[PDB]
Amino acid sequence: SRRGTVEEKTAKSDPIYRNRLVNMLVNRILKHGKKSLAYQILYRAVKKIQQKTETNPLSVLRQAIRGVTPDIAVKARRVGGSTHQVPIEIGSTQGKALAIRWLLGAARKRPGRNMAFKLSSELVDAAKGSGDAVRKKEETHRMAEANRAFAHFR
Amino acid sequence: ARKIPKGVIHVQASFNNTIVTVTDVRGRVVSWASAGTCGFRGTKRGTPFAAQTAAGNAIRTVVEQGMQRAEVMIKGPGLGRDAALRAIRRSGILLSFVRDVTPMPHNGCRPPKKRRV
Amino acid sequence: WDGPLSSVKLILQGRNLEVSDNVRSHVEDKVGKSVAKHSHLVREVDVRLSARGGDLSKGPKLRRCEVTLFTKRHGVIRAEEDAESLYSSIDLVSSIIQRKLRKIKDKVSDHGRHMK
Amino acid sequence: SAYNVQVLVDDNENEERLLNRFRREVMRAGVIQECKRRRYFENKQEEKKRKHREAAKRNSRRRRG
RNA sequence: ACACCAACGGCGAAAGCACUCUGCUGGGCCGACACUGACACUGAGAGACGAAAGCUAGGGGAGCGAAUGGGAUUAGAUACCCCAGUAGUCCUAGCCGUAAACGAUGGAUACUAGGCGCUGUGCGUAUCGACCCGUGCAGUGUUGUAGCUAACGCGUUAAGUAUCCCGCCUGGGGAGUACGUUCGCAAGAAUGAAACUCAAAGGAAUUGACGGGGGCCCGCACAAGCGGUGGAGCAUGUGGUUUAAUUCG
Numbered sequence: 001s002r003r004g005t006v007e008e009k010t011a012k013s014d015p016i017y018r019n020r021l022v023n024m025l026v027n028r029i030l031k032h033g034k035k036s037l038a039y040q041i042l043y044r045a046v047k048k049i050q051q052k053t054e055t056n057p058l059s060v061l062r063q064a065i066r067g068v069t070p071d072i073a074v075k076a077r078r079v080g081g082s083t084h085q086v087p088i089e090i091g092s093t094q095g096k097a098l099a100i101r102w103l104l105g106a107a108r109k110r111p112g113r114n115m116a117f118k119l120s121s122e123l124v125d126a127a128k129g130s131g132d133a134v135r136k137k138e139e140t141h142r143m144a145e146a147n148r149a150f151a152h153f154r
Numbered sequence: 155a156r157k158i159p160k161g162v163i164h165v166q167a168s169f170n171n172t173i174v175t176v177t178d179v180r181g182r183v184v185s186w187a188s189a190g191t192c193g194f195r196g197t198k199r200g201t202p203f204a205a206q207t208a209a210g211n212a213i214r215t216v217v218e219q220g221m222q223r224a225e226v227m228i229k230g231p232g233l234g235r236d237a238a239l240r241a242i243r244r245s246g247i248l249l250s251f252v253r254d255v256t257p258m259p260h261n262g263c264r265p266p267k268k269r270r271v
Numbered sequence: 272w273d274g275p276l277s278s279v280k281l282i283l284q285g286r287n288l289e290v291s292d293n294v295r296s297h298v299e300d301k302v303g304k305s306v307a308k309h310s311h312l313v314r315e316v317d318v319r320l321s322a323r324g325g326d327l328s329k330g331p332k333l334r335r336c337e338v339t340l341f342t343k344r345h346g347v348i349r350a351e352e353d354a355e356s357l358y359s360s361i362d363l364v365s366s367i368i369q370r371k372l373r374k375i376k377d378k379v380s381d382h383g384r385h386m387k
Numbered sequence: 388s389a390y391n392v393q394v395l396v397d398d399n400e401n402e403e404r405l406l407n408r409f410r411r412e413v414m415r416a417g418v419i420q421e422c423k424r425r426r427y428f429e430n431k432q433e434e435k436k437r438k439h440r441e442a443a444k445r446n447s448r449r450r451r452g
Numbered sequence: 453a454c455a456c457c458a459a460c461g462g463c464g465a466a467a468g469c470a471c472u473c474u475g476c477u478g479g480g481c482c483g484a485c486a487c488u489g490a491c492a493c494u495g496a497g498a499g500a501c502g503a504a505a506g507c508u509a510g511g512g513g514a515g516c517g518a519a520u521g522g523g524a525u526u527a528g529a530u531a532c533c534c535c536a537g538u539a540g541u542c543c544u545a546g547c548c549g550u551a552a553a554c555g556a557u558g559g560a561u562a563c564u565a566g567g568c569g570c571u572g573u574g575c576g577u578a579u580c581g582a583c584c585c586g587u588g589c590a591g592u593g594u595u596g597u598a599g600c601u602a603a604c605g606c607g608u609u610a611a612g613u614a615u616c617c618c619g620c621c622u623g624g625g626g627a628g629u630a631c632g633u634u635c636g637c638a639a640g641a642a643u644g645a646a647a648c649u650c651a652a653a654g655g656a657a658u659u660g661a662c663g664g665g666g667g668c669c670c671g672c673a674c675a676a677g678c679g680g681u682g683g684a685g686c687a688u689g690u691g692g693u694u695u696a697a698u699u700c701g
């Protein structure tokens with residue numbers, strides 16, 4: 001990447017709901033390129049989340065992600081022979097990425113039976129602000145703020 | 155404790171830390187704020203940020219005494235020279251004069267040698 | 272050979288030659304000195320011996336020792352020596368290793384203030 | 388009493404203009420470079436180095452511009 | 453101890469000399485004929501001065517700081533960094549006489565393009581007093597012609613063209629040592645070998661290679677991702693051991 005920068009790729013839309021968001025999630029849940037299976041998983045997740053609650057899942061997405069989006073993190077810099085944790089601020093695309101990721105990881109580590117169930121459970125917990133995916137973000141903020149003194153670009 | 159309307163703020167900025175003292179024209183110290191007393195230690199203790207919170211922290215107690223106008227005294231080469239001034243400003247206290255008091259010998263005591271680092 | 276170096280793998284390989292007991296011990300000594308002092312960094316010691324000349328082939332009686340070190344962080348320490356006797360060769364390789372080693376310790380382990 | 392730099396703030400006060408007025412006062416007396424200079428001790432040689440360097444710097448900056 | 457002034461500026465034989473002032477005094481340079489009339493230049497020996505460290509005696513002692521001590525860092529750290537801190541640094545009266553005491557360039561005289569600068573004065577002009585201009589000297593700085601040089605460079609302040617006096621050099625180690633003398637309170641300084649050993653040791657420039665020197669830029673090189681190896685079992689290649697042979701590569 002030393003020379004070239006990256007062109008933008010067409011942001012797709014999930015077939016049923018025509019979302020950029022849901023589509024993002026099905027691409028990151030994907031393993032061994034079986035899109036066939038991933039869609040099934042994601043939709044039986046929408047079905048368990050409409051099962052447990054009567055609220056619109058389309059919105060529970062926006063809450064689940066607004067909940068886990070870090071606005072800041074750190075980065076290790078080498079400054080004057082000193083290795084600092086410098087609290088670099090995060091771009092929006094990067095925010096959504098991070099988000100979906102911690103969601104998915106905390107979803108893969110769950111005690112439950114299905115992946116649909118797990119994903120639903122963590123969507124529910126993240127929308128409530130009640131779960132590991134959120135806690136993780138707050139930790140990143142805690143360890144950003146303690147290191148707040150090392151951002152000289154402040 | 156003492157309600158003094160106009161007084162002076164001495165801010166010493168050294169390379170390892172910045173001290174901010176608040177006083178009155180009688181040459182009397184009311185309250186002080188150090189970047190180390192805010193729960194910062196050796197490295198961070200020099201950064202302009204710790205100076206910011208030092209300044210804010212003193213001006214807390216100075217509005218608590220209910221003071222209005224102040225002069226600012228800046229002594230020393232360090233980073234907080236610029237940083238502290240900002241907090242003095244955003245802390246919504248009228249700024250009368252801002253002076254630099256960094257002492258300059260006109261000749262004198264022969265300094266320490268050069269560190270070979 | 273050493274216990275403080277027990278974490279290190281001493282791999283001794285004759286290429287075209289047969290390895291004796293005196294070469295064993297001597298290798299352990301001369302490589303032992305080099306490695307022992309910087310042991311915290313060191314990982315694997317690879318020593319190959321190559322003989323040539325005299326009755327084997329054409330050219331002077333050369334005995335050539337190659338060693339290789341690896342450290343926990345830095346890879347690739349290479350040293351190549353040509354000389355008369357195996358013993359001489361080994362002494363030389365040790366002389367070189369020592370230098371490169373303490374050059375690495377020097378770089379990273381100095382708390383070198385590298386500002387940039 | 389004594390003073391080096393005198394910055395008097397009027398009641399038109401906003402933070403940035405004040406901060407930069409002051410910053411240019413300090414640039415104007417050269418006080419921070421001064422206390423980086425008297426931090427340690429210099430033999431006559433580094434004094435002649437500093438004189439030639441700084442003087443011919445600002446001087447050639449006056450003769451080019 | 454003397455900020456700013458301070459300058460690729462001033463005086464000094466060199467060492468060096470800078471807050472201010474006054475006093476005693478050394479030189480310099482310039483313009484006039486006012487005068488003497490070769491009174492010159494150099495210098496073996498000899499004499500005076502001569503950074504800093506050092507020493508003797510008496511004071512003085514803030515800061516800094518050998519030595520020294522603690523704290524670290526490191527395999528070690530009798531170092532670098534930090535915390536303390538004694539001699540010494542300062543003054544008076546002496547000794548020591550060495551420095552990259554460097555322009556790494558002994559002194560005097562004569563003579564050989566310029567250009568651009570500065571310091572001192574003098575002249576003419578400008579006004580009638582500050583410039584200003586052109587010029588005469590005296591010194592001081594940067595480019596550069598002839599010529600010189602092994603090159604770099606030096607170039608009216610020569611390392612040019614000549615004359616005079618003085619000091620010094622005659623391959624590298626051994627060695628600026630030993631021995632002996634002279635000087636010194638000492639530390640040491642001055643004068644200065646030989647046996648022996650080597651076929652080199654050195655200067656300037658060039659192409660490389662290298663640099664924990666710069667500046668610019670690339671690569672799934674790092675970062676950002678996704679999946680592996682290392683752990684488990686087997687499959688297989690090599691080393692090692694074993695064997696009559698585990699063919700050689």
Ligand SMILES: [Mg+2]
Pocket residue numbers: none
């Ligand atoms: Mg680019």
Ligand SMILES: [Mg+2]
Pocket residue numbers: 169170197200
């Ligand atoms: Mg510091």
Ligand SMILES: [Mg+2]
Pocket residue numbers: none
């Ligand atoms: Mg002169």
Ligand SMILES: [Mg+2]
Pocket residue numbers: none
């Ligand atoms: Mg006089």
Ligand SMILES: [Mg+2]
Pocket residue numbers: none
């Ligand atoms: Mg006559």
Ligand SMILES: [Mg+2]
Pocket residue numbers: none
């Ligand atoms: Mg003589």
Ligand SMILES: [Mg+2]
Pocket residue numbers: none
């Ligand atoms: Mg004398």
Ligand SMILES: [Mg+2]
Pocket residue numbers: none
């Ligand atoms: Mg002295």
Ligand SMILES: [Mg+2]
Pocket residue numbers: none
């Ligand atoms: Mg003594």
Ligand SMILES: [Mg+2]
Pocket residue numbers: none
């Ligand atoms: Mg000290």
Ligand SMILES: [Mg+2]
Pocket residue numbers: none
């Ligand atoms: Mg010690």
Ligand SMILES: [Mg+2]
Pocket residue numbers: none
């Ligand atoms: Mg002290």
Ligand SMILES: [Mg+2]
Pocket residue numbers: none
């Ligand atoms: Mg004396």
Ligand SMILES: [Mg+2]
Pocket residue numbers: none
């Ligand atoms: Mg001499």
Ligand SMILES: [Mg+2]
Pocket residue numbers: none
């Ligand atoms: Mg000489």
Ligand SMILES: [Mg+2]
Pocket residue numbers: none
């Ligand atoms: Mg003029």
